[PDB]
Design a protein around this ligand. Sequence first.
Ligand SMILES: [Ca+2]
Ligand SMILES: [Ca+2]
Lengths: 511, 512
Amino acid sequence: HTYTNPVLTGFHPDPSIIRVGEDYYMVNSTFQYFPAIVISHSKDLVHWKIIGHGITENEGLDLSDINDSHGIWAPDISYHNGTFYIFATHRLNGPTVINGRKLIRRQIMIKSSRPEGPYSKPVFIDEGSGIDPSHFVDGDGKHYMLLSPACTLFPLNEECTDISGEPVQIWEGTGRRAPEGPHLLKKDGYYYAILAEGGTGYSHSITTARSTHLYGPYEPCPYNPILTQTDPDAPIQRAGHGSLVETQNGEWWAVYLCGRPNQGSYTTVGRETALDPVEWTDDGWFVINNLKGPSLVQRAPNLPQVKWDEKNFDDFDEDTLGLDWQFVRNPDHSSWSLIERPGYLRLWTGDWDLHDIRAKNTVVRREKHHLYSAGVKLDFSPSASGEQAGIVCYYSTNNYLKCCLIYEEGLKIKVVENRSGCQKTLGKKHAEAGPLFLKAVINKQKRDFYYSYEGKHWHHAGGTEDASFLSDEGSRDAKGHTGTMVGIFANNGGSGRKAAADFDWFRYIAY
Amino acid sequence: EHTYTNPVLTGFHPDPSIIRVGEDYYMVNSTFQYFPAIVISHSKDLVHWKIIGHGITENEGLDLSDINDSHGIWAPDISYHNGTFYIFATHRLNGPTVINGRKLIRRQIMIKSSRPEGPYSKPVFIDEGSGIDPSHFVDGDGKHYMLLSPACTLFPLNEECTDISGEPVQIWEGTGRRAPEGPHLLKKDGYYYAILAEGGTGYSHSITTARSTHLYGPYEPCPYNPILTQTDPDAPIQRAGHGSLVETQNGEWWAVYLCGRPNQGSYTTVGRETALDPVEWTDDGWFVINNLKGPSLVQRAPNLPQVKWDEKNFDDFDEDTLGLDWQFVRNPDHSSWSLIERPGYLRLWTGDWDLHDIRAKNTVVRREKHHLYSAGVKLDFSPSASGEQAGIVCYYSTNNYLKCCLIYEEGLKIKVVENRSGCQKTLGKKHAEAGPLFLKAVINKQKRDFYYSYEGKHWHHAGGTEDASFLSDEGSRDAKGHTGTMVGIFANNGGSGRKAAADFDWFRYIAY
Ligand SMILES: [Ca+2]
Ligand SMILES: [Ca+2]
C-alpha cells in the first residue's frame, strides 16, 4: 500500500501521538473551538477517526471570551501505568492576574483511564514562562514536564498536578526562531530531545539533540534539520512540530503538522497532520523520510489497513452530536437540540452575528479538501429584520462567508462575506416559504452558494472568486492558527426572538 | 408515502417507451449514433431505473460507423405480446439512399426477444420511409399493426412483424400542431385512444390525444389538449412531450415522457431526459397528465414498493465485461479496446482519428446526469511521438466537445482543447511529468475545468471554459442535435497510425 500526505486532513495542528498495544491515539490543538483537544484513533497510522475530546464540559474551560486563535494550543498525550495524560497550553487574551501572579498562558493537565475519556476536569499548572507542555517519565518513574523556550525541563509531582522543583533548560536548540514543541525520547541508551524550530510558518522544521544524561549536556544532531520543506513549489509546506511512535512491528514513524498552500501561500483548511517514516542511523541518530522533506506519496506503514466511516452525511437522527462537529467557543446548551425534534439539529436563534465573539452555537466541521460541496436541508421561518439561518464557511470572527435564509423585507437568500473585518453582501435573492436546501460549492479559492426548493434544481445565490481570506495567512488576524470550517448557524439579527432553525441533514461531498 | 423529483431517468434518455410485465417495468430510449443501440432500462417503482441491456449489441446488426451526428436510431418502441418482446425504431440515414431500387432516408427496424434484456434478434428492416417513430399495436383480434408518422398513420403487419401486409390509413391527423409524431394507440373502456407528440421536440413540445370506438376511426380530439406541455418558460423543466402510458399492478396510470433541463439559458446540456407524471382518467372518458399542470418538479411517488439500484458511479474496470452504463460513439473497434489484456484496466489502443472525425473509434462515454459533477480517471499512458494522446472528454458531437489529454507535443503535455461548433481552440497546455497520471473534469453549470494530478491528492489547473453552452442540443449548432453531453475516455495517435496502449485504472463520477 501507499498513502498520500496529509493523513489527517483539515484543521489538525500540533499532532501528538502514542501507541497502546495495537491502537494509536493522537491529539490536536483546538484553540477557540469546543469541545477542546480533539482525540483521534487509528490502527494503521494512515486512516484516522475522531473518538472524543479532552474537555467537553463548559465548567472545565471558559472559551466564551477567548480571542481568535488563542485558547488551547499544542496538546501532548501520553500513557503510563494505565493512565492517559493530556497536557496543553491555554493561551489567555493578555496579561491576567491569577492568584497574585500575572500570566498570559496557563498549562492544563487532564487525565483518564480511557483514551476517549471522559477526562478529569482541567487542572491548571500556572507556569506562564513557555508553551507546549510535554509529559516525560524517566526510567525511575519520576514525572517531568517539558516546556518552551526550547527544551526546558520541569519536575512534576507523581500526580502531575504541580511542578515539584526548579526548571533547567537542557537544550537551547539550534538558534532557529521560536524553539518550541519540546519532546524527549529515551532509546538505545540516549535521551533524544526533539524541537519544532523556525516558527509554524514556511520556515518550520524539526531539529534534535542527544545526551546520555537526562539533564545533559546535549549534542546537536549532525543531520539537522531532520525534517523541513526546502522546495517552495511543493504542495506541502510548513512541516514541523513532530511526534514519534514505534509500531508493534518495530517500524518508527513521525506525525507532524503541515500546510497545503491553496493557489498561493494560503493554508485554507488550516494546518493538517502528515506522516512519514523515521529511519535510525548507524551513528546513533534518526531522520525523517531520509532527509527528503515531506512525502507526497509514501509506502504505507506495515500495519493492517483499517478504514473508518467518515460520516460525511449527517441526518441528525442520534440524540448525541457527531464527533466531527465543533462549536465555535462554548455551546449555549439551552439553544441547540437533537432531541426537541428527533431527526433534526435545532438551533434556536442567538442574539449575535458571526462577527461578534459572543455568537453562540455555530456548529462546524473541518474542510478536508480544496474541492468539495456542503449542503443542508433547512426548516426555518424568520419573521423579523435580521432573523437568519443557513450555512457558513468560517475561519474567524473577522473572516467568514455565510449563506442564509433571512427576513429582510420578506424572505431572502443572502450571501455575506466578512473579509478581514470588512462585511459585504455578495448576493441577495427572493426566497419562497417552506423547506429549503442550501449548498456551498468550493473550488480552490472560488466559492459559490446555491439554493433549491426540492434538492434537484439549483440556483446561484452568490459567491466570491477570491476566498483567500479564509486561511491562516489571508485572514490578516493577529494570530491565524486554526483553519476554515464549514457548518451551520442561526441568529435573530438582534430582534431578541428565539426562533427554531431545524436542519434535517448536513452533507459534505469531496469531488 | 414518498415523493420524487423529475426527471426520474436523468441524462441522455430521449423518446421513452415503457411496458409493465407482472411486477417489472421496462423502458427503451433512443441512442442515435451511440452503440450498443437502444438502451433498455428496468424499474420496479417507476422512479429508480437501471440499465439492463441494449437492443442491438453486435456490429454486424447495425453499421453506425459512418452515420452522421444525431442520425441513426431514433424513438424506440417496446412492447410485449404472447411471450415475445418487440422493439421498433426508425433508423435515420445520412440522406437519400437507394435500397432495393427505392429512395429512402429512413428505415424501420424490428427486433424481438423472449427476454427483456435480450439478446435480441438481428435487426430486420421494414423499408417504409414515409415517416418516423414506429409503434407496435395489437388489436383485440390478435392482428399486428405498426403506427408511424405523419401523426397516426396505421400500417398492418404480418403475424411475424417482419413486413407490412396492407395499405396504410392515417386514422388521425393530429391537432394542426407541427411535426405530429410518436404515435401510440391504447385500447381501454371501449375506446381506441390515439396519442401523439406534437409541436416538435423543442420548447413547443406537447402531448395530444383523440379517441374513437373503431380502430380506423373516425377520431375526435381530446377537449383537454394538450394533456401535457410546459407553458411556463421560467420552469426548470421544458420540452415536455413524447409520452408513453403504463398501468401499474395496482391500477394506477402513469406516463413517462421526454423533457429537457435548461442549463443557464435554453441549453439542454445533458440532452433530453425521461420524466414521470401521473395519468388521471376523467369522468367524460378522457385522460390527462398531472391534472393539466404541466410537468411536476416534485410529485407523489407511485404506489409501488421502493427499489433502488447500485448506480456504478465508480468503475474500477475489474470485470471482463464492460459496464452497461457505458456507450461507444458509433460501433466499437474490438481489436483496439480490451478489458482482458490488462485485467483491472480498460485499455484503449490509440486509434487513427481524432474526435472531430466521424471515423474516430472507441470513445467510451457515460451520461451526464447532473449539472454539478466531477469525473476523474487514473491513466497509465506513454506517448512518445507527436499527436499521441489519451484522456477524458466531455462529448456532445464531432463538432462539439471538450477534451483533456496527456499528449506528446514536443514533450509530454497536459492539453485542454475545445471544439465549439466545429472551431477548435487550445484552452490550456501544461508541462507534464512521466508516469501514472490523474485527470479530473469539474463541471459547474456552464463552467467546466480540467485538473491533473500525479498522486490524486494535489490537483493543478490544466484549462477550462466559462461557457460550455455549445455542449447542448441548442448550443451545438449541428444540423441535428438530438443527443446529450456525455463524459468518458478516448485515445488516438493523431493520424500517425501508431498503436500505443492507454490503460485507464478507473473512472469516477461524483455528483456534488
Ligand atoms: Ca434528519
Ligand atoms: Ca482498476
